[PDB]
Amino acid sequence: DDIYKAAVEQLTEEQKNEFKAAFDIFVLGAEDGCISTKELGKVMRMLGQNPTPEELQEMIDEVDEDGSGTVDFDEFLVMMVRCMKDDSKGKSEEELSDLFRMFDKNADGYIDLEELKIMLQATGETITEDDIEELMKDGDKNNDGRIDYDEFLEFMKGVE
């Protein structure tokens, strides 16, 4: 998403200090200023921060849609500073309970691919082939066709 400007303005010193240290480690001369994300990940690994890196490497293999491979500040800088948990409040548990109860038109304790497709047609998103399998992963942790409310809670918890 486009949180890039608010993020470059919003970071507080607890992570800004390490950002500056990583900047010093990164840029020592004869650099274009784009800050290559390949060296950035190694530098942050050297810093001792403990987020998840494999998603970042895959993203760089995909994200920055033009396929430049040298991410400018926004996206790879976010992936770097993603050590800190600036989440979307996790929403509210009661809100999601009310939503899931609303979605349970079957009134059988769970919502399956038919109801998900019904809601998607109600909103009108681009049809994805990752469907079915996404429900199997998130909601079907028991391989039984049953999905409780915590599965939907952790499906999009703190999503921006």
Nearest distance in Å: CB 37, another protein: 14
Report whether 101 belongs to an annotated binding site: no
**50 marked as binding residue:** no
Q: Which is nearer to another protein, 36 or 97 (CB)?
A: 97
* Nearest-approach distance from CB 121 to another protein, in angstroms: 12
How many alpha carbons fall within 13 Å on the CB side of residue 53? Answer: 13
131 is in an annotated binding site: no
Which stretches of the chain bind another protein, using CB under 8 A? 1, 55, 59, 62-63, 91, 95, 97-99, 101-104, 107, 109, 119-120, 122-123, 125-126, 128, 130, 142, 146, 148-149, 155-156, 159-160
Output the furthest CA–CA distance in the chain (Å, rounded): 64
Nearer to another protein, 31 or 108 (CB): 108
Q: Tell me whether residue 140 is annotated as binding.
A: yes
- Sequence-distant (6+) residues with CB within 8 A of 19 are 11, 80, 81
Report the nearest approach of another protein to the CB of residue 57 (Å): 12
Within the chain, residue ranges assigned H as helices are 4-10, 13-26, 37-47, 54-62, 73-81, 93-103, 113-123, 133-138, 149-155
User: Within 10 Å of residue 74's Cβ, how many Cβ atoms?
Assistant: 15
Q: Is 65 annotated as a binding residue?
A: no
- Retrieve residue 25's tokens: 């480690």
Query: Contact, 51 vs 28, CB < 8 A?
Result: no
CB of 28 to another protein, least distance (A): 19
* Helix, strand or coil, per DSSP, at residue 97: helix
Residues of each annotated binding site for Ca(2+): 64, 66, 68, 70, 75, 104, 106, 108, 110, 115, 140, 142, 144, 146, 151
Residues of each annotated binding site: 64, 66, 68, 70, 75, 104, 106, 108, 110, 115, 140, 142, 144, 146, 151
